[PDB]
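Subject: S-layer protein structure
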Amino acid sequence: AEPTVASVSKRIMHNAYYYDKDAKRVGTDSVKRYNSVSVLPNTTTINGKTYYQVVENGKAVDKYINAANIDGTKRTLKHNAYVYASSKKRANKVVLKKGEVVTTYGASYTFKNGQKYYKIGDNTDKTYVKVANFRL
Ligand SMILES: [Cl-]
Ligand SMILES: [Cl-]
Ligand SMILES: [Cl-]
Ligand SMILES: [Cl-]
């Protein structure tokens, strides 16, 4: 009966638009990683994509966040991979191995070197893996 008793505060892991039920961007705001937003805990599906419905001022509103930006996407490495903070800087000494399941959070990032990277890790750390390592 009260959306604000049911709501959970999810951490945004990739900057996120608000969408309406027609999967069109609504308004001019976006939630920035790694801020949190109040949503209903059960996802819904709009045009074959998974979303969380926003709760604002006591009510479930016609504003939806793509679950890719909160839960991310489970992916498998097709190649061994390093973890990068930026184009040239390694984040750590980890070697992720071919076949490992890794969750990536939202759309890839093109770095200054022109290569694409996904954010990994259930945390605010600057830890990115090359998109190429998820493809054959
Ligand atoms: Cl944005
Ligand atoms: Cl988005
Ligand atoms: Cl690599
Ligand atoms: Cl963290």
